[PDB]
Symmetry: C4
């Protein structure tokens, strides 16, 4: 993984079952709550601060997700988008990066075309076998439990930028970019 | 399981403890949130697209559940229905299928008559022993964690229709029927 | 456990960490959602139908809990009550039963006086060691995951009344008392 | 741990991933629900009653968190505070205690400066390796599942004050200070 992890400048993430644990919390009007993970959020800020852009690609759209996106300072994203191959290529163009500079993390069949578009692919731990087979690296953490952060930790460390998370002094240098 | 799985044209599912993990999220006015699983939802759409109808049978009713049902394009259902044997037979009549073409997935005693009505029965992994004893197949996944999708995956693969989930090209052929 | 389980006519249950998993879901105004378990609810109805009364004893009170209590047909209860010894004795008096006819299920220190008041005591699986030490029986299921139902199943079976849950015909005889 | 645990007079806790399991439950307007743990709450009251002050230190702020803080009788706290070293020292000054009388419990990189400021540090069980490496003691319980209570139990027992939790009589002596 080292040689691909080293050249990542852009990360695209699916939401449901990656940034969340797959649960859709309905009320009478549809999605009412989305549950994201706090250590994921910090990982997102760490990547951005380390000159790695972050994008969101989801087959669902909601004002809730759009709010979490704003909270995190995420700029590039396509929502309600079920055909994800063309979506990935469009996001890379906006990011000013190539496919081999791009990493994608997913959990289900809808992500299979995204895995094909991006140079590096990750699956969350609770992903089905046919998804795990299609990615470069299967993560040890379940979706919505820090799976993104585990990935972001890997990418940063590969590029020698682990101080932001493994030392008090490293964190307290990018602290203005953390929230 | 192959010979029964091959002839399934209709799936009836219980909600609480199957499509959910059994939790009822109350507020002051009763049920306030229901949590469904995203990979279950995709499995539901995949079955329908593969000419397998899907129905919901629940001993509880709520505007929340009725919304999730609408979101998924599910047509046939009986809610607030605790006597489930007659309910299953009525649903099969509406579906235009027979009992041996019908599969049911449940988690508790209330589902025991449904298991008797349908030709093929599944239990979620966290079902009690007396429920596991009564079904044809006990699933490895807990309710609300993809138990339905595990079943739907099994049914499709038995009928040679796994491409919709295990290949990017298969998924990107039924993509208009996925949401 | 058989000889005590056989003579139980009354069950008193704690809420947080027994009927729930211990989580308190706050909004700005305090408790906003309480999550109960569906298989617990059915167990509650089964006990009542088998001439075993059910009571709730909680150190917290909320309109949410009061709603779930009404939904279940539970009549006897004391809420916001942190001194639970006197509370248990008062509930037994209302139930028309004795201490050796009474079972209590708890998860934390506040339940320790309740264990002392009632003849039979249960601890949920995730209870601390000092709680497990104080009860007659430690359950295998975690609080809010069917711990009550596991107990209710035990009590009924001890008294020869397991048909209501382990047979379709048994369930479909008390079906009007199930919801 | 005994010699440090014995002289603790002040505990500072992080919220997300310690008092909660790391999940941020968004609606359209941001954080909509925070989930705390009931056995944690009792541990908080037990510490305070045993002349150990409790403080909250979080990089996030919300009316929800401020409500839970009020519910628990917690007085000292700094919210929305991402640089936590100076924050810890300020809290100790308000508490009238020293650094070697102070214990901190965290789960992520943002807590690394807090670990350095306080004499005794704890990590929740699901904390990353670089956090576990930085603390005096790694807890066996996951964040939001009683990790705080496990710590509070340890501190009290070290100081000979375990009766409040391991005996009915001990609990029923500080019962007015428990809620
Ligand atoms: O919202 C989050 O997920 C995030 O990780 C984001 C960060 O901005 C950071 O604020 C962290 C906490 O505030 C750190 O204690 O929350
Ligand atoms: O709501 C869902 O559960 C579902 O699985 C349904 C599908 O329509 C699909 O939209 C999927 C996601 O949108 C795929 O990324 O959500
Ligand atoms: O609300 C429940 O927990 C309960 O178990 C109660 C029962 O009344 C019953 O209705 C069951 C479901 O309705 C059975 O499918 O819900
Ligand atoms: O809100 C809680 O977490 C707390 O633990 C706090 C305590 O005040 C106590 O009231 C307990 C329950 O009320 C005990 O049954 O709740």
């Amino acid at each position: 993984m080292q040689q691909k992890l080293e050249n990542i400048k852009f990360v695209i993430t699916d939401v449901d079952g990656v940034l969340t644990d797959g649960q859709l919390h309905y009320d009478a009007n549809g999605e009412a709550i989305k549950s994201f993970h706090v250590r994921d959020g910090l990982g997102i800020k760490m990547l951005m601060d380390a000159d790695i852009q972050v994008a969101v690609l989801s087959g669902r759209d909601s004002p809730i997700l759009r709010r979490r996106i704003a909270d995190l300072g995420i700029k590039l994203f396509f929502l309600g988008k079920l055909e994800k191959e063309t979506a990935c290529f469009d996001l890379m163009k906006q990011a000013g990066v190539t496919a081999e500079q791009t990493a994608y993390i997913g959990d289900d069949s809808v992500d299979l075309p995204a895995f094909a578009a991006c140079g590096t692919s990750f699956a969350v731990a609770d992903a089905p076998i046919y998804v795990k087979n299609a990615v470069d690296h299967v993560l040890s953490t379940h979706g919505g439990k820090g799976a993104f952060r585990e990935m972001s930790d890997m990418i940063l460390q590969a590029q020698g930028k682990s101080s932001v998370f493994d030392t008090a002094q490293g964190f307290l240098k990018s602290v203005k970019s953390m929230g």
